[PDB]
Amino acid sequence: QVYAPLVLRDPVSNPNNRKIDQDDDYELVRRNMHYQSQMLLDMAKIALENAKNADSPRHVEVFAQLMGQMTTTNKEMLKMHKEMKDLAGA
Amino acid sequence: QVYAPLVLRDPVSNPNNRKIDQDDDYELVRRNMHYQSQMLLDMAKIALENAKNADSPRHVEVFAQLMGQMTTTNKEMLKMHKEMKDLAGAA
Amino acid sequence: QVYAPLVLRDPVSNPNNRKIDQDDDYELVRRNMHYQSQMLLDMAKIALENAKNADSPRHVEVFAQLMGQMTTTNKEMLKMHKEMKDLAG
Amino acid sequence: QVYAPLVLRDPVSNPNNRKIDQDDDYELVRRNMHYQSQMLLDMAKIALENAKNADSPRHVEVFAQLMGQMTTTNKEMLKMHKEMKDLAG
Amino acid sequence: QVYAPLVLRDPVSNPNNRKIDQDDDYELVRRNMHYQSQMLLDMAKIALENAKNADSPRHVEVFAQLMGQMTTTNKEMLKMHKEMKDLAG
Amino acid sequence: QVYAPLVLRDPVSNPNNRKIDQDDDYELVRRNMHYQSQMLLDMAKIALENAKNADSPRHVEVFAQLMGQMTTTNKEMLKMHKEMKDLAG
Amino acid sequence: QVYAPLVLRDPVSNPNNRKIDQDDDYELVRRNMHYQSQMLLDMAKIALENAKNADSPRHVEVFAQLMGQMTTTNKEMLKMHKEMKDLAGAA
Amino acid sequence: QVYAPLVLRDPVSNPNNRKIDQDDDYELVRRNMHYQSQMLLDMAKIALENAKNADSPRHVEVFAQLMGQMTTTNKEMLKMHKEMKDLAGA
Amino acid sequence: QVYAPLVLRDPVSNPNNRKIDQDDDYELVRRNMHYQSQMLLDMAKIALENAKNADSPRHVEVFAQLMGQMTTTNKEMLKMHKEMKDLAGA
Amino acid sequence: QVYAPLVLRDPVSNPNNRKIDQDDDYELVRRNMHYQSQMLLDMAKIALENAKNADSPRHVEVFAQLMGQMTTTNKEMLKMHKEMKDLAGAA
Amino acid sequence: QVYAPLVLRDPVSNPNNRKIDQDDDYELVRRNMHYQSQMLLDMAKIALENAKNADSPRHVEVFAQLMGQMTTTNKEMLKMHKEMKDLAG
Amino acid sequence: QVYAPLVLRDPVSNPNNRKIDQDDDYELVRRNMHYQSQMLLDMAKIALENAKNADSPRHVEVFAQLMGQMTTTNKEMLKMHKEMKDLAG
């Protein structure tokens, strides 16, 4: 099964009314961060069980790497809100 | 395998009423951090006993690396409360 | 394959009326960021399922790498708006 | 060597009464730091005796690495308290 | 696969009337940034489909690398405008 | 081998009376530092003699690495006291 | 090969009338930057089509690296004008 | 000959009279630094002679590494005294 | 053909009249930068054509490295003039 | 080999009369720095002649590395006097 | 080969009349810088022609490395004069 | 190729009259810097001719490395004088 090619979607941009673009991009960024959280957790549950049953240092090592990424992605969720607070500021 | 594919859940966002998004995202981040705590510990207990019985420098090395990640992840839980404190504040 | 060769397209530039170029470049940058969001998500969905079923640390490792890039690229979106806020004016 | 899957437990969070969450999270973090101390020491005692008896630079090298992590993880306990002091401020 | 040698074209410079050079160089730089955007996107579209169909961590890894460069190169467009704003100052 | 499995021990935490936890954590951290001092020296004495007799650059290399870690771990002891001085209060 | 050896050209310098050296060196640097622009683009067009038709991660990887250098080199053109502006200024 | 296992020794700590702990830990740190100096010099003398007689770049390289560590360990001896001076300060 | 050995040339230095040394060293530095520019361009033209005709990622990669060095060497030409301006200053 | 084992010497320390420890430790550090000077030079003379006669890039490479360490070690001798000067001072 | 062994030469030092040593050391440093300029150029001319004729990426790679070192060593010449300006006095 | 062991010579130190030690150590440091200059130049002259005649990128690469160390070591001579100037202050 050859995967279906991606069809790109052009946004409508507003350089002289940027607030509406900023609103839209917040929604996009938020959506993506929720997606990442879901995907990382999904992978982690399986990677954990694989590592536990594998007596394989390699499996432990990649699980640790996954946790690292989960933490990084986690931290960015709160930073996003700080960034938005700053943007509404000056 | 073959594992059920992940079905993504699109959040509802509120760029002009962001406080409810912030509340929701705090709960999500906190949930995730608790999940990581549980997962890291579950892995660590098994990695430790495997390393102890392995007489294998590679096992000890990876265990040390796991401990490093556990520390890095654990540190962020209190950092998150500092972030939330600032988020409620002046900035 | 053989893929059609890329034909490059020249913009019209205005060094002494730069605001119009700045407007156009914002639209280009934002478009590319949306394109990247779309492409990263498309890759991630497949990479995730491949990694889940691979029974392979290598697959998980590259998936984590992909997530790292997704986060990095993602965080640049609000940075762009901060940049535009500073820029104008 | 066959393990039962991890059962995840959801915490209850309180975005508009965060202090009770902060209290609970301090207790979780401190617990985990104590766990890491215990696990690191447990590993170190065995890694030391293995390295002493192995006549193997590789064992010594990894024991040094372990001591490095022990120090790092150890340093974080007092940093936790400094963070909590700042949190209360 | 046999290519004609590059013929280099000399610009005319004006050390004591540099503003006309600066104008021309802005146009060249902006053109090149637009070219890079087009080339990166062109490569990305194909690299994505190859990675999706390869079931290969190596393809995913390199696609991530490409996205990284796309973001970096993309970030530089607005930086160009900030630089030009400072130049005029 | 098979080694007895580690049984983890939970501390009792006091988020609203943290000084008592801070006291206990200082004692734990100091104990671990003394333990590390003792273990590093124990390893070093054997690693030194092994390296002296090995006729092996690898042995000397890892011995130097061990000394580096010993110094790093060692220097943290007085840093701890500086940290405690800042902490209280 | 065997390519004609390079014959080096010694400039005439003026430590006590440096402005003419500065003028000359600006022209040289600008010429070189334009040459690099031309060379990088000429390479990029071919590297791109080779990478597109190669189904080869190595080709994509090196193309990305080439793009990185192109960005780094391209950035210096405007930085050069800033440098020249400062050179005319107070400092 | 299987080496005798290490028996760990618990210190007595005093969170509310820390000065006596600080005195004790200075003595421990000082002792260890003197130990390191002695061990590094002991290794270096042998590593030097081995390198001189080996026409082996590898031997020279590790001797250089040893000297690096000796210098680092050396520097920390004086820094220890500066640290102690600061601790008696405020 | 064994290359002719380099015969080194000692400069005359003037620690108590350093301005004349500074003039001379500017001329030397300038000469070298012009030499580098010429050599880098000379190599680049050939490296470019080799890369174009080689369908070899390795050739592209080294050409990119060469361009990196050309840019670095380029930037230093202008920095040299800034350095000289500063030296005539205080 | 088998070399005589090292017999460690425990110093007598004075946390409440630290000046005599400082005096002693200065003498020790200075002695060690002089020892390193002697050892580095002794090694360098032989490494140099070996490298000169080796027609071996590896020999030249390691010699360069040795020179690097010699510079780094040599620099610390005067840094030590600065440290001692500060130790006598206000801080 | 066997090359004549190097005979080291001791300078005469003056800790309580350092200016004369500083003068001599400036002359030594400047001499070495001129020597390095001469040696780098000598190597570069041959390395360039070798690289041009080698049909070998490795040759070009090391040539670029050589150019990097030439630039680094070259830029230190005017830094030296800045250093001397600060030094005296 | 058989060498006599190094005989270490103990200096006499004066913690409570440190200026005479400082004077002696300046002379030792300066001597060593002059020695390094001589050794580096001696090696460089031979490494250059070897690299010129080797038609070997490896020889060029290592010659560049040597020039790098020569510059670094060379830079330190004037830094020594700056340090001494600060010491007297």
From TrEMBL, chains A, H, I:
A GO term for molecular function: identical protein binding
Name of the protein: Terminase DNA packaging enzyme small subunit
Organism: Aeromonas phage 44RR2.8t
Upper lineage: Viruses, Duplodnaviria, Heunggongvirae, Uroviricota, Caudoviricetes
Part of the whole protein covered: 25 to 114 of 154
From TrEMBL, chains B, G, J:
Highest taxon of source: Viruses
GO molecular function, a single term: identical protein binding
Protein name in UniProt: Terminase DNA packaging enzyme small subunit
